[PDB]
Structure 1
Amino acid sequence: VNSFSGYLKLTDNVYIKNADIVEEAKKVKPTVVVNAANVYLKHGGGVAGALNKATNNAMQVESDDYIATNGPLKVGGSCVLSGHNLAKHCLHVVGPNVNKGEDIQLLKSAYENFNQHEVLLAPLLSAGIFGADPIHSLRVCVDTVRTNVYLAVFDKNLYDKLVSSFL
């Protein structure tokens, strides 16, 4: 039993809800929140910009130190950093950005990072400003993630479309 509330169950381990991941993180304080990161951990917009703003820029400060030490992430890769006031940990995961021409097959590799964590609150990878089809992102998620994932979908219209078309 965990503290997540109001989700629709898609499968044994995948759940979905119309929610702002920032407000959801602040209420649940999950062990792991997933950020829709880029390789430079520059949290300017989309989910990343929103999560970072909610940390009063502490996420960006921590991220800049991480990059200065380690260099950029790989597309499809991840790193674990602090969750600040939102979660115990933030798993920064880099899905391919279609608007940069990155290979969509890397979306499966991106979701594989979730399997290192028993329970996660997460957005749909490569959705939104990353340019991929969110119905495909949900499908890859379901077919790749085996741990318990709670997907927060900001757009109510998109949320309803994701459910009604799910197989």
Structure 2
Amino acid sequence: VNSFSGYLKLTDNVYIKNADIVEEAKKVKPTVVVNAANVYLKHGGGVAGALNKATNNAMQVESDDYIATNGPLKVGGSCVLSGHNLAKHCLHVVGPNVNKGEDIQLLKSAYENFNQHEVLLAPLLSAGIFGADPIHSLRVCVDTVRTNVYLAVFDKNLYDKLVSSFL
């Protein structure tokens, strides 16, 4: 039993809700919140900008130190950093950005990072300003993630389409 509330159950291990991931994180304080990161951990917009803003820019400060030490992530890769006031940990995952020409096959690799964590709150990878088809992102999620994932979809209109079109 966990504290996630109001989710629709899609599969054995994948759940979904129309919710602002920022507000959802503040309420549940999950062990892991997933960020829709880029390889530079520059949290300017989209989910990343919103999560970072909610940390009062502490996420960005921590991220800049991480990059200065380690260099950029790989597309499809991830790193675990602090969850600040939102969660115990933030798993920064880099899905391919279609508006950068990056291989969509990398989306499966990106979701594989979720399997290292028993329970996660997460957005759809490569969705939103990353340019991929969110319906496809959901399919890859369900077919790749085996751990318990609670997906927050900000746009109500998109949430309804994702549910109504789910096979």
TM-score under structure 1 normalisation?
Answer: 1.00
The structural deviation recorded for 1:43 is 0.0
- Structure 2 partner of 1:155: 155
Identity within the alignment, %: 100
The structural deviation recorded for 1:79 is 0.0
SS across alignment from 2:86? coil
Give CA deviations for 1:86-123 in whole Å, capped at 9, x if unaligned: 00000000000000000000000000000000000000
The structural deviation recorded for 1:72 is 0.0
Give the distance between the partners of 1:4 and 1:102, measured in 2 at CA. 33
How many residue pairs get aligned? The number is 167
Give the distance between the partners of 1:30 and 1:24, measured in 2 at CA. 9
The structural deviation recorded for 1:148 is 0.1
Give CA deviations for 1:42-66 in whole Å, capped at 9, x if unaligned: 0000000000000000000000000
Q: What CA RMSD, in Å, does the superposition of the two structures yield over aligned residues?
A: 0.1
The structural deviation recorded for 1:70 is 0.1
Give CA deviations for 1:132-151 in whole Å, capped at 9, x if unaligned: 00000000000000000000
The structural deviation recorded for 1:83 is 0.0
The structural deviation recorded for 1:125 is 0.1
SS across alignment from 2:39? coil
Find out whether 1:64 has 2:69 as its counterpart: no
Superposed structure 1 runs of 4+ greater than 4 Å apart:
none
Give the distance between the partners of 2:104 and 2:165, measured in 1 at CA. 21
Give the distance between the partners of 1:164 and 1:42, measured in 2 at CA. 34
Give the distance between the partners of 1:47 and 1:106, measured in 2 at CA. 19
SS across alignment from 1:47? helix
Give the distance between the partners of 1:165 and 1:20, measured in 2 at CA. 21
Give CA deviations for 1:17-49 in whole Å, capped at 9, x if unaligned: 000000000000000000000000000000000
Give the distance between the partners of 1:152 and 1:48, measured in 2 at CA. 14
The structural deviation recorded for 1:126 is 0.1
The structural deviation recorded for 1:152 is 0.1
- Structure 2 partner of 1:130: 130
SS across alignment from 1:85? coil
SS across alignment from 1:150? strand
